[PDB]
Design a protein around this ligand. Structure first.
Ligand SMILES: Cc1cc2nc3c(=O)[nH]c(=O)nc-3n(C[C@H](O)[C@H](O)[C@H](O)COP(=O)(O)OP(=O)(O)OC[C@H]3O[C@@H](n4cnc5c(N)ncnc54)[C@H](O)[C@@H]3O)c2cc1C
Ligand SMILES: Nc1ncnc2c1ncn2[C@@H]1O[C@H](COP(=O)(O)O)[C@@H](O)[C@H]1O
Lengths: 319, 254
C-alpha cells in the first residue's frame, strides 16, 4: 500500500510539519513493502526537492500548478489527481491553515474516509483507527472508516516525530490539472502594531488571557511583569481586542516562545492553538479558577485561584 | 442582496461529566448549550455589511440541530438577523461535518444567497470542516480563516486576509458568491454576553434518513472516553501561600 503525504511550504520555506507527516506515515505503514509518497505543490516547488529528499520518503512528486503558494482550488484538484495516480490507503495533510482551505472539500466530493486534527493513529489489523478530541479537548473520540479504501486525515502539528537523516526518493514532476482558480493570492502582510521585544528570544514570560476581564485590568499585570522581571505576553483575545500588541501574542497564529524557560499563564484556558506557542516551556505555572481548564494538563504547577488576588499578593511579596 | 450565516449551537461540559452507557458520547445531562463563539464574529461581519450598505442586505442565520437550537436562533434575531432557519429531523442525529455540509447546502440552494459565512471551527468538536464542505457541495469559491473582508454588496470579487501561522496574513482576491470561514478577531461583536424561527424538515429540502445521520458520515465513532491527561502539581492553601510558592519557583528559575 501507499501512504500519501502532502507537504507544506510558504514564502520559499518548507514548513517543518511536512517532516512530522513523513514520520507519521512511516510509523503507520503495515509492512516494509508499503511506500510513502510525498507531494509538494507549487509553481516553484522543485526548490523543495533537497529538503524533502529525506529518510522515509520513497517517492517525491513535484506538482506544478498555477500559484506559487497555497491556493485551495489548485490544491484540491492536485491532491485529487495524486490520489487517483497513487491509490493511497491513507492521505496525510497537516491540520494547518492551508489545509483548512480545502481538506473537507476534497472529502465531500468522493467516498473517502475523513477526520481532522488527529493526534493518535494506528492500524489494528487492517483497520485504520484515528483519535481526535471532543468537547473542547475534554474527551478523546476514537473513529474508524468502515469500507473506505482511501482515508484522508489532517494531522495535529507537533505530535508526530520526524525521522532523522537523508533519503533517496524517486523524484517525479507532474502538472496540476488545468482548471483556473476562483481566487488569486496577493500580498503577504505582517500582523500590525509595535515590535519593541522579540518574544521568541525571552526567557521569562507572564501571559494574560480573557480571564483578566476589562482592558483596565491590563495595567496591573504589566506592573507585575515589570516588578518580576518578566515579559508580558497574551492569548489571542487580548491582542485581537487591541489591548496588547500582536507581537506579544503566543500561539499558532502568534509566536512560539522558543527561548522561554518559565511561563506564567494567568486567565488562559489552554486552547490547543495557545499551547502550540508554549507547551515546550520547561516550567509552566497556570493560574486559573477553572480546574477543568486544559492548561493544567500541561502545567508543571497549578493554582486554582483568582488571578487578581494572586497578582496583588505576588506584587506585595515581591516588594 | 442576502448573506447566509451558518451557525452552530455548541455544547460545553460541566465538571464531573460522564460518558454515556453506550460509550459513544457524553451524557447530555452534563451539557450547557450556547452559540458557537466563531458565529458571533461571522454574524457581526454580516451585520457590518448590512449597516455599511445603502442597499438592503437580508441576513439569514441557519442551523442544523434539534429544538434546543431555537434559543440561539432567537438571540441572533434579537441582534438583528432578519430571518432564522432551523433544519432538523431525528434521523439527522450523528451527522458529521460533511453530512451537515450537505444539509446546509440544500437550504442554501433555495435561499440563493450572495455570500455564505461559516465559523472557522466549532468550540466543541473543532472539526474546522463544515463551512468548506458547504463550499464543495455548492461548488463555490472559498477561503478559510478570514480575518479581514473587503466587500460591497453586488461586487463580483472581494478581498480577504487569511490569518496564517506565525504572525502573518495573506491577502486573497476571491470571486463572489463565495463561502468564507470567519476567524475570531475579525471584528468586535457588539452584544457580547414576535418573528418566529422558520422550521424546516428533511422532507422540506428533499432529503431522507438515508442521506443523513451517523451511517452517512465519513468516519464512525468507535467510542468516546475521558483520556488520562497530564497532571499539574496543584498548590493549595491561602493566596499568600500560593503566591509564596510562585516566588520560590521564580527564584529557583532566577
Ligand atoms: C486557526 C486558529 C488560530 C489560533 N491562534 C491562536 C493563537 O495564536 N493564540 C491564542 O491564544 N489562541 C489562538 N487561537 C484562539 C483559541 O481558539 C482560543 O480562542 C484562545 O486561545 C482562548 O484564549 P483564552 O484562554 O485567553 O480565553 P478563554 O478560553 O475564554 O479562557 C479564559 C480563562 O480565564 C479563566 N478565568 C476567568 N476569570 C478568572 C479569574 N478571575 N481568575 C483566574 N482565572 C479566570 C477561565 O477559567 C478560563 O479558563 C486560534 C484559533 C484558531 C481556530
Ligand atoms: N449543525 C450546524 N448548523 C449550522 N452550521 C454549522 C453546524 N455545524 C457546524 N456549522 C458551521 O461550521 C462552523 C463550525 O465548524 P466545524 O468545526 O467544522 O463544525 C460553525 O461556526 C458554523 O458556521
Amino acid at each position: 500500500s501507499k501512504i500519501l503525504v502532502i507537504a507544506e511550504h510558504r514564502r520559499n520555506d518548507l514548513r517543518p510539519v511536512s517532516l512530522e507527516l513523513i514520520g507519521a506515515a512511516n510509523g503507520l505503514k503495515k509492512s516494509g513493502e508499503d511506500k510513502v509518497v510525498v507531494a509538494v505543490i507549487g509553481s516553484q516547488a522543485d526548490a523543495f526537492v533537497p529538503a524533502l529528499s529525506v529518510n522515509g520518503v520513497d517517492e517525491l512528486v513535484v506538482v506544478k500548478g498555477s500559484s506559487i503558494d497555497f491556493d485551495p482550488d489548485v490544491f484540491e484538484a492536485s491532491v485529487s489527481a495524486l490520489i487517483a495516480a497513487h491509490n493511497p490507503s491513507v492521505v496525510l495533510l497537516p491540520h494547518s491553515v492551508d489545509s483548512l482551505g480545502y481538506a473537507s472539500s476534497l472529502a465531500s466530493k468522493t467516498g473517502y474516509g475523513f477526520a481532522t486534527d488527529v493526534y493518535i493513529v494506528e492500524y489494528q489489523g487492517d483497520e485504520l483507527v484515528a483519535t481526535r478530541g471532543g468537547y473542547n479537548q475534554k474527551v478523546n473520540v476514537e473513529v474508524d472508516f468502515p469500507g473506505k479504501s482511501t482515508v484522508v486525515l489532517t494531522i495535529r502539528p507537533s505530535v508526530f516525530k520526524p525521522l532523522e537523516g537523508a533519503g533517496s526518493p524517486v523524484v517525479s514532476n507532474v502538472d496540476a490539472p488545468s482548471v483556473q482558480s476562483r481566487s488569486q493570492n496577493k500580498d503577504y502582510v505582517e500582523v500590525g502594531g509595535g515590535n519593541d521585544i522579540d518574544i521568541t528570544t525571552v526567557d521569562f514570560i507572564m501571559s494574560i488571557g480573557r480571564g483578566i476581564g476589562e482592558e483596565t485590568n491590563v495595567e496591573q499585570f504589566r506592573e507585575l511583569a515589570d516588578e518580576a522581571g518578566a515579559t508580558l505576553c497574551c492569548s489571542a483575545p487580548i491582542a485581537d481586542a487591541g489591548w496588547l500588541p500582536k507581537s506579544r501574542q503566543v500561539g499558532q497564529s502568534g509566536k512560539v516562545v522558543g527561548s522561554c524557560k518559565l511561563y506564567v499563564a494567568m486567565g488562559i484556558s489552554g486552547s490547543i492553538q495557545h499551547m502550540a506557542g508554549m507547551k515546550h516551556v520547561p516550567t509552566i505555572i497556570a493560574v486559573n479558577t477553572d480546574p477543568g481548564a486544559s492548561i493544567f494538563t500541561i502545567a508543571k504547577y497549578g493554582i486554582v485561584a483568582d488571578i487578581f488576588d494572586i497578582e496583588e499578593e505576588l506584587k506585595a511579596q515581591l516588594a | 442582496m442576502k448573506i447566509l450565516v451558518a451557525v452552530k449551537q455548541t455544547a460545553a461540559l460541566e465538571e464531573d461529566f460522564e460518558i454515556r452507557e453506550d460509550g459513544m458520547d457524553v451524557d447530555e445531562d452534563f451539557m450547557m448549550y450556547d452559540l458557537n463563539e466563531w458565529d458571533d464574529f461571522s454574524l457581526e461581519e454580516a451585520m457590518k455589511i448590512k449597516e455599511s450598505s445603502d442597499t438592503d442586505v437580508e441576513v439569514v442565520v441557519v442551523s442544523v440541530g434539534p429544538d434546543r437550537v431555537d434559543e440561539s436562533l432567537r438571540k441572533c434575531l434579537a441582534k438583528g438577523a432578519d430571518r432564522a432557519v432551523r433544519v432538523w429531523d431525528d434521523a439527522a442525529e450523528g451527522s458529521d461535518a460533511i453530512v451537515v455540509g450537505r444539509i446546509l447546502t440544500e437550504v442554501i440552494k433555495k435561499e440563493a444567497p450572495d455570500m455564505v459565512f461559516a465559523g472557522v471551527q466549532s468550540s466543541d468538536q473543532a472539526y474546522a470542516s463544515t463551512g468548506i464542505s458547504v463550499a464543495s457541495y455548492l461548488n463555490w469559491p472559498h477561503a478559510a480563516v478570514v480575518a479581514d473582508l473587503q466587500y460591497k454588496p453586488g461586487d463580483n470579487k472581494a478581498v480577504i486576509r487569511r490569518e496564517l501561522e506565525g504572525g502573518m496574513l495573506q491577502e486573497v482576491e476571491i470571486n463572489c458568491p463565495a463561502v468564507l470561514t470567519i476567524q475570531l478577531g475579525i471584528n468586535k461583536p457588539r452584544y457580547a454576553s414576535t418573528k418566529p424561527i422558520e422550521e424546516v424538515s428533511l422532507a422540506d429540502i428533499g432529503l431522507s434518513a438515508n442521506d443523513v445521520g451517523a451511517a452517512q458520515s465519513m468516519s464512525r465513532v468507535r467510542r468516546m472516553y475521558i483520556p488520562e491527561k497530564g497532571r499539574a502539581t496543584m498548590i493549595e492553601g491561602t493566596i499568600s501561600e500560593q503566591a509564596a510558592k510562585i516566588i520560590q519557583i521564580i527564584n529557583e528559575f532566577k
